[PDB]
């Protein structure tokens, strides 16, 4: 199962999170080409991304939004509380997929092992072509800083689309 | 077996290979295999796997529809959660189509809920062939009805991979 | 790649995608051309195999077309026996679709020359996807030309098959 590719980056006082739309089951059959797995939370102030199952993304998004309300949009505090509740859930603890959360000032990666990580260079990618978009993003962040955060999000996913068969160019960028 | 569903021009239809069954009315009725009406006849569901697992998933999805007041997406997500969490059901590779007057969704044991791009999906052995025929008809033969698209798509899939029953919602 | 040939209303067309992955899932070519016109644009040829072996088969079939001066059936038969005969081309299991004004033929390295049933034939991974869309268009959208049918049939296959892209080249007769 491949449920789209998501790339997040904070750059030049702005924040963007983009994703393609290809959903592929197995190794050969495409089921959707215009999916949108990027979800806005907390009155449009928080962008969250999960390239896993819809059943798991629904439980995690509902619990992260719940924790965001408890701590009044505190991204860091709500992420570490969701992480231990993630690890506490014995159905969600088996999940190897990671969860990206970000507001205006921070990007965080949340794991089922309870780990909360701020990624190096303020960018991270998930999904089938995530490691490809992550590589393009590190290059653009270091050698093409003239691009905006939104341009970096689209261009890195565009590179992943031209290389990965499980990633298309139906890219939608969400900006805070 | 193959199952095809499509929403087109305010009408919904789901088709599959046919059979003659006796129901509560004890009168011969030509139905579609592994295709059942649920939620007081307001939704149509189809499963490509076993007939026993089909009715197992049909009963679970109807209770979910009753829990969440007929919200197709909410009940589909909850069914996918209970699907991936069941011992015997999560091993199944066959997918389930759920469909009402407003949307079509495909639920899988992996925990996924997919809304097809153009209100059009097919499952089963010749599913991708009927999907290819349906996508061509949806774009170039939009004059056909939802029931006609269902019958014609399954006919093309049979010619490559006659007793076709189409259920109109 | 995925090649799709269609004869419709006295017109002939052949379409092919251009994605090349070389056995992995990494795309290194997106605009490959595996559908060429031979015999001064009188016949169309499509190879589903490698880009280099396609050039060898296109040239050999081009020569056989000259030596028989346009007889597709004889040129394809003599190509199949020369294909099966040569040491380095005999093991290629990818098929070659050749097509002139009147007929479609499928040449194989086994020495076999197949005359397909209907005027619709496809080869490659997403061949059955384009064939499914082709029979749908040929039955409910016959107003489309053979060129439009070839492109639209491959477009449907590109959106469903992972290893078939939408960079489609279409050649007509």
From Swiss-Prot, chain B:
Catalytic activity: ATP-dependent cleavage of peptide bonds with broad specificity
Active site (record annotation): 1
Subcellular location: Cytoplasm
Positions of transmembrane segments: none
Record's keyword annotation contains Protein transport: no
One Gene Ontology term from the biological process aspect of the record: proteolysis involved in protein catabolic process
Protein name: ATP-dependent protease subunit HslV
Organism: Staphylococcus aureus (strain Mu50 / ATCC 700699)
Lineage per the UniProt record: Bacteria, Bacillati, Bacillota, Bacilli, Bacillales
């Amino acid at each position: 199962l491949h449920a789209t590719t998501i790339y997040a980056v904070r750059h030049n006082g702005k924040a963007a999170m983009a994703g393609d739309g290809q959903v592929t089951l197995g190794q050969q059959v495409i089921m959707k080409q215009t999916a949108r797995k990027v979800r806005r939370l907390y009155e449009g102030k928080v962008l969250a991304g999960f390239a896993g199952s819809v059943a798991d993304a629904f439980t995690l998004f509902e619990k992260f939004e719940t924790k965001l309300q408890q701590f009044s949009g505190n991204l860091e505090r709500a992420a570490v509380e969701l992480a231990q509740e993630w690890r506490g859930d014995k159905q969600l603890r088996q999940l190897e997929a990671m969860l990206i959360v970000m507001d205006k000032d921070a990007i965080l990666v949340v794991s089922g092992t309870g780990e909360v990580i701020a990624p190096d260079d303020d960018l991270i990618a998930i999904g089938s072509g995530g490691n490809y978009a992550l590589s393009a993003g590190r290059a653009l962040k270091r050698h093409a800083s003239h691009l905006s955060a939104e341009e970096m999000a689209y261009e890195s996913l565009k590179v992943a689309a031209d290389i990965c068969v499980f990633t298309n160019d139906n890219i939608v960028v969400e900006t805070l």
